[PDB]
Amino acid sequence: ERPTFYRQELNKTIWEVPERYQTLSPVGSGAYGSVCSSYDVKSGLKIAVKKLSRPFQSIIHAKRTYRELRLLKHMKHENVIGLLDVFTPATSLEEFNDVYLVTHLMGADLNNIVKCQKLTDDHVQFLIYQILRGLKYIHSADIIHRDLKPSNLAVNEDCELKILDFGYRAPEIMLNWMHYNMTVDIWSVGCIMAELLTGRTLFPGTDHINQLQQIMRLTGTPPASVISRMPSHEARNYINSLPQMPKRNFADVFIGANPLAVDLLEKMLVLDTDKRITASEALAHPYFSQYHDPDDEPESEPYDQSFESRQLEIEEWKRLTYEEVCSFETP
Amino acid sequence: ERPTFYRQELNKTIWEVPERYQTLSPVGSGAYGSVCSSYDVKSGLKIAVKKLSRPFQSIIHAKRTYRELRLLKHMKHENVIGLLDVFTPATSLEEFNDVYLVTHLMGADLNNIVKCQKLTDDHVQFLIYQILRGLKYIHSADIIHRDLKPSNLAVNEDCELKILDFGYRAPEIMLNWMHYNMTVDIWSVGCIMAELLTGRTLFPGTDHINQLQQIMRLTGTPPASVISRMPSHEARNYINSLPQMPKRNFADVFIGANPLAVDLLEKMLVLDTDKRITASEALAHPYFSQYHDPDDEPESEPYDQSFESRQLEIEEWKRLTYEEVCSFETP
Ligand SMILES: Cc1nc(Nc2ncc(C(=O)Nc3c(C)cccc3Cl)s2)cc(N2CCN(CCO)CC2)n1
Numbered sequence: 001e002r003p004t005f006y007r008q009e010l011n012k013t014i015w016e017v018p019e020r021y022q023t024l025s026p027v028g029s030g031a032y033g034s035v036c037s038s039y040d041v042k043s044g045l046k047i048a049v050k051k052l053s054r055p056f057q058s059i060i061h062a063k064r065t066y067r068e069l070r071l072l073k074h075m076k077h078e079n080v081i082g083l084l085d086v087f088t089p090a091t092s093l094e095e096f097n098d099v100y101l102v103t104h105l106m107g108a109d110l111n112n113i114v115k116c117q118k119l120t121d122d123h124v125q126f127l128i129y130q131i132l133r134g135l136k137y138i139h140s141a142d143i144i145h146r147d148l149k150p151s152n153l154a155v156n157e158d159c160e161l162k163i164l165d166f167g168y169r170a171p172e173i174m175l176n177w178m179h180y181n182m183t184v185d186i187w188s189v190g191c192i193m194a195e196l197l198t199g200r201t202l203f204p205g206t207d208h209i210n211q212l213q214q215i216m217r218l219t220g221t222p223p224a225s226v227i228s229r230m231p232s233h234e235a236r237n238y239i240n241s242l243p244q245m246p247k248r249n250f251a252d253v254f255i256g257a258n259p260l261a262v263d264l265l266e267k268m269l270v271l272d273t274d275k276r277i278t279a280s281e282a283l284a285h286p287y288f289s290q291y292h293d294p295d296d297e298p299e300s301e302p303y304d305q306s307f308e309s310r311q312l313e314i315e316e317w318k319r320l321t322y323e324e325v326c327s328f329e330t331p
Numbered sequence: 332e333r334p335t336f337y338r339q340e341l342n343k344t345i346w347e348v349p350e351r352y353q354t355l356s357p358v359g360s361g362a363y364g365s366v367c368s369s370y371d372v373k374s375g376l377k378i379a380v381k382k383l384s385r386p387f388q389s390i391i392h393a394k395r396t397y398r399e400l401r402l403l404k405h406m407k408h409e410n411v412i413g414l415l416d417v418f419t420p421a422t423s424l425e426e427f428n429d430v431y432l433v434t435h436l437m438g439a440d441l442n443n444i445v446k447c448q449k450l451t452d453d454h455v456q457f458l459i460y461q462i463l464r465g466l467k468y469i470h471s472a473d474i475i476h477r478d479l480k481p482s483n484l485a486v487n488e489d490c491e492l493k494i495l496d497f498g499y500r501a502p503e504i505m506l507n508w509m510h511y512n513m514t515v516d517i518w519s520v521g522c523i524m525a526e527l528l529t530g531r532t533l534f535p536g537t538d539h540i541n542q543l544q545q546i547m548r549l550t551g552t553p554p555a556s557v558i559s560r561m562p563s564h565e566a567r568n569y570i571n572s573l574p575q576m577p578k579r580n581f582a583d584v585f586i587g588a589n590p591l592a593v594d595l596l597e598k599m600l601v602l603d604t605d606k607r608i609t610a611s612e613a614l615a616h617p618y619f620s621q622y623h624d625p626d627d628e629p630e631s632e633p634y635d636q637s638f639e640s641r642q643l644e645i646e647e648w649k650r651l652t653y654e655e656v657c658s659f660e661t662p
Pocket residue numbers: 027028029035048049050072081101102103104105106107108109112154164165166
C-alpha cells in the first residue's frame with residue numbers, strides 16, 4: 001500500500017518522499033544523484049536518502065540506474081553499503097520517472113578520516129580490518145562494473161566502516177584493469193593505512209610517472225621479466241635503476257608504529273603483484289588478532305550480471321527498474 | 332637587448348608582452364596557463380602566446396614550468412608544436428616571476444575536426460599521415476613525462492596539423508602505461524581515423540569496461556595467454572566470449588571508405604599489441620602513397636631528461652628556467 005508522501009523543494013529540485021523520512025537535509029552531491037540526511041521516524045535512525053539525477057534520460061543513465069539498484073540490493077555485508085529502501089511517488093510505469101534509494105548514513109569521507117587527527121593504534125586496526133573484510137566480500141562477487149573500492153570508504157563517529165559506491169581507450173589498458181583489479185585494491189589499503197599511522201602522504205610524486213620512481217625507493221625495482229619487455233631501452237633505464245636519492249626503509253618511515261603494522265605494510269606495499277598480500281590472507285595476519293574471526297568473514301552469493309551484456313532501449317531499462325522498485329520489501 | 336614591453340589587463344590578469352606581439356586576444360585556457368592569439372609584427376604571422384599560471388608557486392609548478400620549456404625547445408619537427416619565443420618582463424632572477432611561451436596558432440581542436448563535416452578522402456590521408464609522422468618523431472624522443480599525444484592534435488584551415496602539449500596509484504598501472512605507451516597511440520589514431528571517415532564514435536560504451544566488450548566485436552577475443560591469467564573465472568568469462576549480438580565487420584562499418592583506408596584500420600585496430608601496426612610501418616602502408624617519403628620522416632635527437640630524476644627546491648627550478656629564458660635565441 002502506498003504510504004502518505006510529502007513534497008518539498010531542496011536546492012531548486014522537487015523531492016517527494018514517504019511520511020517516514022522527515023527533516024531532510026542536503027549533505028552533498030555529484031553527477032550520479034543528490035543525497036539527503038533524513039530522520040526515519042519508523043526505525044528511529046538518521047538515514048541517507050538519494051534522488052537520482054534524471055535517471056532515464058539516456059540508455060546509459062537508464063542502465064546506470066538499474067545497475068546501482070541491483071548492486072545495493074545484492075550487497076549484504078556489514079562493511080558494504082546496502083539498500084534499506086527504494087521508492088517512487090509514481091503510481092504507474094508510464095508516469096514513472098523519479099527514483100530514490102535509501103541507505104545508512106555514514107558521517108565522514110576518507111579525506112576527513114586523515115585530518116581526524118588523534119587516532120590510537122586500535123582505531124587503525126579496526127578501520128583497516130573493516131576495509132579488508134569488505135574487500136574480501138567485494139572481490140568474491142566479481143562485480144563487472146567497478147563502483148566499490150577502498151577509497152570509497154566511509155566512517156561514522158565510532159569508527160564503524162562501510163564502503164560506499166562513490167568517493168579511444170585502448171584494450172590493453174582495460175584488460176590491465178581487470179587483470180590487476182584485486183591487487184590494486186590492496187595497494188590502496190596499504191597507502192590508506194600508511195596515512196593513518198603517519199598523517200602524511202606515502203608516495204608523493206611531482207607527477208604520476210615520477211610517482212613510480214618514488215614507489216620503487218621503498219619497493220625496489222621491478223623483476224627482470226617486467227623490465228625486459230618495456231618498449232624502449234630508455235624505458236628500461238627508468239625502471240631498472242633508482243637514482244641516487246637518500247635511502248629510505250619501512251622501519252624508518254613508520255617509526256612510532258606498532259611493529260605488526262609495519263610488518264603488515266611490508267606485505268601490502270610490494271611491487272610483485274603475485275607476492276603481494278591478498279585480502280583474506282591480510283585478515284589472518286597477527287596485526288588483527290583481536291578482530292580476526294575466520295568464520296565471520298563471509299564471501300558473497302553469486303551475483304547475476306547478465307544484464308551488463310544486454311543491449312537495450314531506454315524504455316526496457318526503465319521497466320526492469322520499475323519492476324524492482326515495486327518488488328522491494330523494506331527491511 | 333630588452334625590447335619595449337607594453338602592459339594590459341586581460342581577464343583580470345596583467346599581461347606584459349614585447350612590442351612585436353600586438354592585438355592580443357584570448358582564445359582558451361587550462362590549468363597550465365592562459366593562451367592569447369597575437370599578430371607578431373616582425374615575422375607578420377598570427378601567433379599563439381601563453382602566460383603560465385603562477386609558475387613558481389610550488390615544486391610541482393616550478394618543475395612543470397621548466398619541463399615545458401625544455402620540451403618545446405627540444406621538439407623540432409613540423410608536425411610537433413615548437414617554441415618560437417619565450418620571454419619575461421623580469422630583469423633579474425630575484426624579480427623573475429612571470430613566464431610567457433610562444434608558438435604557432437592552430438585554431439581547430441580534435442573535437443572541432445570531427446564535426447568539420449565535408450572532408451575528402453585526401454584530407455584523411457593527410458591528417459592521419461601527419462599524426463603518424465609526429466608519433467614516429469615523438470616515440471623516438473623517449474619522453475618520460477607524457478604531454479604529446481594523438482588526441483592533442485590541432486589543425487589550421489588548410490588541414491596542416493601539429494600535436495600540442497594538451498587537449499594511491501599502484502605500480503602495475505603505471506608500469507603498464509610505460510609498457511604500452513606506443514601501442515595505445517596507434518589505437519587512438521585508429522579511432523580518430525575511423526571517426527573522420529564516418530562521423531560516429533567507433534566504440535561507444537555504456538561505460539568503460541563495457542567498451543572492452545564493444546571493441547572485441549571488431550577485434551575478437553584476447554589470446555589464450557592474456558585470458559589464462561585473469562584474477563577470476565568470471566573475469567575469464569567476460570573476455571573469452573562475445574555475447575550474441577549482431578555480427579559486425581570492418582568492411583561493413585567503413586562501407587563508403589577508400590578500401591585502402593579499411594586495410595590500414597584492420598592493421599591499427601588489432602587487439603594483440605604485438606601484431607598491431609607501428610607508426611613507421613603505418614607510414615610505409617599503400618594508403619599514404621603520395622605523402623610517403625622515407626627520407627623525410629625523421630626521428631628525434633636524444634633528449635636529455637636527467638632533470639626528471641632530480642629532487643630540487645622551487646628556487647633551483649626557477650634558476651634553471653630563468654637560465655633557459657635568457658639563453659634562448661628567437662628564430
Ligand atoms: C555527500 C555526503 N555524504 C555523506 N555521507 C553519506 N553516507 C551515505 C551516502 C550515500 O550516498 N548513500 C547512498 C545512497 C543514499 C543511495 C545509494 C548509494 C549510496 Cl552509497 S552519503 C556525508 C557528507 N558529509 C557531511 C559531513 N562532512 C563533515 C564530517 O565531519 C563530510 C561530508 N557528504
